[model samples]
Target: PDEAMLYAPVEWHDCSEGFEDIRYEKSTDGIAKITINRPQVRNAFRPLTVKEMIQALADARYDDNIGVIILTGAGDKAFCSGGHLNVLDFQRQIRTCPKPVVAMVAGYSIGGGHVLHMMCDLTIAADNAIFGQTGPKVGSFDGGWGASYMARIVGQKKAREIWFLCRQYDAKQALDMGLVNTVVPLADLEKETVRWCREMLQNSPMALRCLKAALNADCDGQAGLQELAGNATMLFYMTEE
Candidate 1:
C-alpha cells in the first residue's frame, strides 16, 4: 500500500520560460511540477537556479489550486549534478527550504543533489538513478545542518559510511537505506510520481496540511533541532542578499 502522506490531490499543468532553466506547471485541480531546465549542465543548481526554484515552490504554496509539488531534472544523464559551485556554492542553503518538496530522480543525483533530495518530504528515484554525498572527494563541504538532519534520517553509522565512501548507490540500495520511498523504471517515473500524488489527495487537505505541520513541529523540538534549523535557514536568506 502507498503511504498516505505521499499522496497529492492536484492535476499537473506545464509552463515554459527563460533559457530552459526551470519549467513550472500546476495540475488542473491539485498538484504542481517543477523541472530543472539545464539538462546540458546536467540540471546543476546555481544561485539563480535555486532562487527561481524557491520562487516556484512559494508560488505553489500560495496557489489554492496547487496541492503538492514534484521536482526533477531535465534529462536522464543526471537529475542534478549538484549545486553550480560558481553560483550557489553549497548544500547548506538547500537544507533550509520549508516546502514539502518531492524529488523525482533519474540517473545521477550526487553531492548537493543528494542534499536536495534529503531535504524533501519524499523522493522517488528511477531504477537507474544513483545517489551519493561526495563532498569529501570534490573538496566541497556539507557538515553543518546537513549532517545533523541526515544523521536523523540515516543514522550515525550509515550516514558516515555514505559520506566517507563518497560513492554512488543505486536505487535499490537507496530504498533499503530509507533514502528513497520508491524505485521504478525510468519510463515509469512520471506515472509513479502522479500515482503517489493522487493517493495523497484521498484525505482531506486540511488534515494533510495539519498533519505535516504537526509532525515537523514535533520533530523540530528534538535536541534544540528547531533552533539549528532556523539559524541555517536565516543564514541562507541573509547571505543571498
Candidate 2:
C-alpha cells in the first residue's frame, strides 16, 4: 500500500530579497533555485539578469547547507532566448562553483541562452526545448568556453558543425549529441530535475567537490589544479598531523 519515496519534498520560498529581472529562492530541502524573470522577448537576459544570477549562484555556492542549485526560465515559452552576452565571467562562475548546478530548460535555448546551458554542470531539458548557437554567421561569437567546451563535449567536427552550420536541435536530438543529460515531457521537467538533484545530494559532497575540480583541471591550466589541490588541502585539515 505504501510506496518508497526517495526525495524530500522541496518547499521553495522567496529569497530574492531584492532584485529585478530574476527571482531567487531557497528550498526547505536545501536547494537553491534562480529563475530568469523575463519572458517578453522569450526570457532573454540583460545586464541585470546576469548580475543577479551571479549573486544568487554565489549565495548558493557558498551556503553551507545548500546541496544543489537550479537555473531556469520564468515561463513555458523558453528557458532563455539568449540576450547580448556575459560574455565569459558567467561561464567561469558556473564552472568554479563548488555545488553542482542544473539548468532546467523548456522552449528555445538559443544564441547566448544555449551557451549558458552548456556551461551548467548538468542540463535537464523538456521535450519542447530547442538548443543551439546562433553565432559565426552572425557577428556575435562566443570564442571562450562556448567554442572551447563544445569541442570538449561533442568533439571537433560536431562542434564546427554547430558553430558554423548554425543549426538548432530539438531535445531528443540534443540528448543524442550529448548536449543534455535527459529529456522528459514538459510536465515532468521540474519533477525529474529535482529527482536528479536529490540523487546527487545523497552522494558525498567532498567527493563531488574534488571530482568536479579534477574534471575541470585538465581543461583549465594551473588554476584548475588549484581548485582540486585546495580540496586536497581541506581534506588534510580534517586529520591530525
Candidate 3:
C-alpha cells in the first residue's frame, strides 16, 4: 500500500477475525495502529486481552499493506493499566509475539502493566505517564522471565527498587531510567508516534521481520518458554482445589 493509504480519522470497521475486544486501524502513512478497546476497565490486559493482542500483532505482521505498527489504549488514562491477574499472564506470553510492538504509555502503568511496556521493542510515553511494578506489594511473586527482563533493562539495583520496593516513577523518571524511548507532551504523542512509525515503514519489511525474530531469539531461553506450558499442566493435575 502507498504511504498515503494508511490512516484516516474515520473509525475502522475492519479488524482481525479473532480479536473482538481489539480494534485495528491505520494512520495515513501506512502505519497500522492497534488499540486495546476495553476503556471501561482502563484498558487492562485480561487473558483474552493478551490473546487478542497477539492475534492483532500477527495480522499486522502478515499484512502486505502495513509497514509499521503502533499500539495504544483507547482512552488517555492508560496505554494499558496493567495485566489482568485472573486471566492472561504476560510473563507467559511476552516471548511469543512476532512483530516489533511499540507501546504508547499515557497514564498509570503499574504491576503487569510495567511488564507490558518492557516487552515491547520500543515505547513512546506521554509526559504524564506513571510507571511501576507493584507485583510484590500485591502478593504476586515476580516470575523469572519478567524479573530477568527488568534486570537487564535497568540493572539489578534499580530493578530491585522498582519490583521489590514497588516504587512508582513518572514519565521523565522512566525515560531517565531507560524504561521508555521517548517522552513528549500528550498533545504531541500521536504526531511523534506517527513520525517514528513512518521511519520504520521506510525499511524493508522482510528485513525488519527477520531482524526482530533473530534479536528476540535469545529471550526464548531466559525462562524456558516451556515453563508456562508446564505450569498450566501442573495447575490442571493438582485439581485438589
What is candidate 3's CA lDDT for residue 146?
Answer: 62
Summarize candidate 2's per-residue lDDT along 131-181 as a digit string, tens digits.
889887678888888898888888888888889988989999899989899
* Tens digit per residue, CA lDDT, model 3, 1-241: 4535332232334665556677887544466777888888878877887777766666776776777667788878887777645333443443454445678778877777777777777899999888888777778855765687777778788888887788889999999988899999998777677666766777775456555655555555644435444445655786875
Give candidate 3's TM-score: 0.77
lDDT of 1 by residue, 100-172 (tens): 4678999988888777777677899999999989889988767754576678777888899989888789999
Candidate number with greatest TM-score: 2
What would you estimate as the lDDT of candidate 2? Answer: 0.87
Tell me how far the alpha carbon of residue 201 in candidate 3 is from the true structure, in angstroms, after superposition: 1.0
Count of clashing residue pairs in every prediction = 10, 1, 3
TM-score of each: 0.79, 0.95, 0.77
Report how far off residue 75 is in candidate 1 (Å). Answer: 1.8
Candidate lDDT values, in order: 0.72, 0.87, 0.71
For model 1, the superposed segments whose C-alpha errors exceed 4 Å read 1-12, 18-20, 84-99, 222-241
lDDT of 1 at 151: 80
Point out the worst 10-residue segment of candidate 1 by lDDT.
Answer: 86-95
**lDDT rank, highest first?**
2, 1, 3
